[PDB]
């Protein structure tokens, strides 16, 4: 019955479709692609032309938003929510509260709401920060992002001269995590938290490969970490790095009146982190509809909604099932 | 403008909570009421108050955490509270929680008060996580753990067997289990899969160790669905490694996507001491439930119905961009 808007075709995108296949309670209603009229009339599927997007008015519930660009959402997103209900996962953290703020009016003027920066970080990551500090004032939030992909610092290394096209991996440290765990509580320097590792298809003119080390001395994205370069070809790239795996772990280390070690830990696991994130869009989106069948208006965060919200079962049945 | 708590019930718990809310800048103890003869216990315990006073503070009591002691009022008390303030409690009893709900928010609309219900790790923080898994993850299998802690029960339970001179026992998750779980092999677990069971005995005078043993190990409803092993040891060593106060678990929701990729999401709790960790989320929860009840919030909640933003004394301005 909930009508399903999809903007943007990449990983997540197809991630939501298929995703809200597992969610008996939701219809997809189209999917709406920059691509240009040039295709097979459409490929047939749900693609449609995003200048088709105003036609959907009263006939789409909720659109989520899959670009992967925080930059594009941020004229993306006012010019959807002021016409629909949204969801999406602006990962800018710092950018964070100018999304909101400009989500925020354009949602309150046009009636409708909009939910920002969900996922899994920010998102539920960010959930179980808030959770860890609110349980355990006295103490010690630690967040780790496991093996996999940051995007942002794939692109990053991309500006550097020499490279054609590469992917940088960010790893915790063990001995960072079971330090965390132990409940010690501590102080950790960014660089004994996690390293960083790259594989990198250069040449320009077969472009000096050691000059190539423009990553490590990065500012911001690399130097604060350990870094390790690699080489490799084109090939090899394509079928060894689909860096779709990911996870992290979000860990509160503190101390109840006494010195009593408390340990409060979150983490994922996730074979496709693009699918995981598309999962929790479309849990989120329920939550949207509910809140705005019930009159709520403007921009809100995970850290607004509570977790029955996301799910279609009724309040008695979640408690006598797993309260 | 500090929220003004009220501890009911002076046993483990409202000792925790009175030790939390010295954690928290933006609460106040204004009382704790106990059945107990006040006269008898010192006088310089300021906070101390008898039971029978407790409509006296009915306008100075924001937030009434219920710490029952243990008494049948641990569960018969709280309709009593609910009358006359807002409350909080840990109502642990899952199979008895939808009665509890209906009674509680039957006589907290009556009062025009809000009662919130079951918060703690399990039920309550636990609670959230099964939720958050399967609304995330809605294909796929969810699987509670309970750390390494004590069944009051079953310690009585060993001490009833002959040759037992005293004893405990924990319920310990078993790694494989947890192991299997956190990969993404989707499966259900049988009752012996995924707990053992471990007991400290002190034997009496000779007793026959071999027949302890096995009469704990083949004793009906407690332990004979499960692997348990049974060491040996004196009071001496009960008394010093056996307080018996941590506690933990693992709430495991292990999915898959549309494609079969695996998807695993993981909560866990390591409690030093249980008590004092199910105390400081009483607190955290009492102010969630102030901010509902001045804004009007009438009725029984649960930890499902509350937003994480409440359980912070910081701004929603501050929220976002400091953790968000």
């Given at each position: 019955?909930?009508?399903?808007?999809?903007?943007?075709?990449?990983?997540?995108?197809?991630?939501v479709?298929?995703?809200?296949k597992?969610?008996?309670?939701?219809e997809?209603?189209?999917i709406?692609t920059?691509?240009?009229?040039?295709?097979?009339?459409?490929?047939?599927?749900?693609?449609?032309?995003?200048?088709?997007?105003?036609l959907?008015?009263?006939?789409?519930?909720?659109?989520?938003?899959?670009?992967?660009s925080?930059?594009?959402?941020?004229?993306?997103?006012?010019?959807i929510?002021s016409?629909?209900?949204?969801?999406?996962?602006?990962?800018?953290?710092g950018?964070?509260?100018?999304?909101?703020?400009?989500?925020?009016?354009i949602?309150?003027?046009?009636?409708?709401?909009?939910?920002?920066?969900?996922?899994?970080?920010?998102?539920?990551?960010?959930?179980?920060?808030?959770?860890?500090?609110?349980?355990?004032?006295?103490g010690?939030?630690?967040?780790?992002?496991?093996?996999?992909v940051?995007?942002?610092?794939?692109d990053?290394?991309?500006?550097?001269?020499?490279?054609?096209?590469?992917?940088?991996?960010?790893?915790?440290?063990?001995?960072?995590?079971?330090?965390?765990?132990?409940?010690?509580?501590?102080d950790?320097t960014?660089?004994?938290?996690?390293?960083?590792?790259c594989?990198?298809?250069?040449?320009?003119?077969?472009?000096?490969?050691k000059?190539?080390?423009d990553?490590?001395?990065?500012?911001?994205?690399?130097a604060?970490?350990?870094?390790?370069?690699?080489?490799?070809?084109?090939?090899?790239?394509?079928?060894?790095?689909?860096?779709?795996?990911?996870?992290?772990?979000?860990?509160?280390?503190?101390?109840?009146?006494g010195?009593?070690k408390?340990?409060?830990?979150f983490?994922?696991?996730?074979?496709?982190?693009a699918?995981?994130?598309?999962?929790?869009?479309?849990?989120?989106?329920?939550?949207?509809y509910?809140?705005?069948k019930?009159?709520?208006?403007?921009?809100?965060?995970?850290?607004d909604?509570p977790?029955?919200?996301?799910?279609?079962?009724?309040?008695?049945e979640?408690?006598?099932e797993?309260?």
């Amino acid at each position: 019955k909930i009508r399903i808007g999809i903007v943007g075709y990449g990983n997540i995108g197809k991630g939501v479709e298929k995703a809200i296949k597992q969610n008996d309670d939701m219809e997809l209603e189209a999917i709406f692609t920059r691509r240009d009229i040039n295709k097979v009339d459409s490929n047939n599927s749900k693609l449609v032309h995003i200048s088709r997007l105003e036609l959907y008015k009263d006939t789409v519930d909720v659109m989520i938003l899959c670009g992967g660009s925080a930059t594009d959402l941020v004229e993306q997103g006012p010019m959807i929510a002021s016409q629909f209900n949204t969801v999406d996962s602006f990962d800018n953290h710092g950018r964070i509260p100018q999304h909101f703020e400009r989500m925020d009016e354009i949602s309150k003027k046009a009636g409708n709401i909009s939910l920002i920066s969900t996922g899994w970080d920010p998102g539920l990551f960010s959930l179980n920060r808030l959770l860890g500090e609110s349980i355990l004032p006295k103490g010690k939030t630690h967040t780790f992002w496991g093996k996999g992909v940051s995007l942002g610092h794939s692109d990053a290394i991309r500006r550097v001269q020499g490279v054609k096209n590469g992917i940088q991996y960010i790893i915790p440290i063990k001995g960072a995590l079971d330090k965390a765990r132990s409940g010690e509580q501590c102080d950790f320097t960014t660089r004994e938290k996690h390293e960083m590792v790259c594989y990198v298809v250069p040449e320009e003119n077969a472009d000096l490969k050691k000059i190539e080390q423009d990553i490590k001395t990065m500012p911001d994205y690399f130097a604060d970490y350990n870094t390790t370069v690699h080489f490799i070809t084109e090939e090899e790239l394509k079928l060894n790095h689909a860096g779709l795996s990911n996870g992290g772990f979000v860990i509160r280390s503190g101390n109840t009146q006494g010195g009593a070690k408390q340990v409060m830990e979150f983490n994922l696991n996730l074979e496709s982190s693009a699918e995981f994130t598309s999962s929790v869009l479309v849990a989120y989106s329920r939550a949207i509809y509910k809140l705005s069948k019930e009159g709520k208006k403007g921009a809100v965060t995970v850290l607004d909604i509570p977790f029955s919200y996301l799910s279609p079962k009724t309040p008695e049945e979640l408690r006598k099932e797993l309260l």
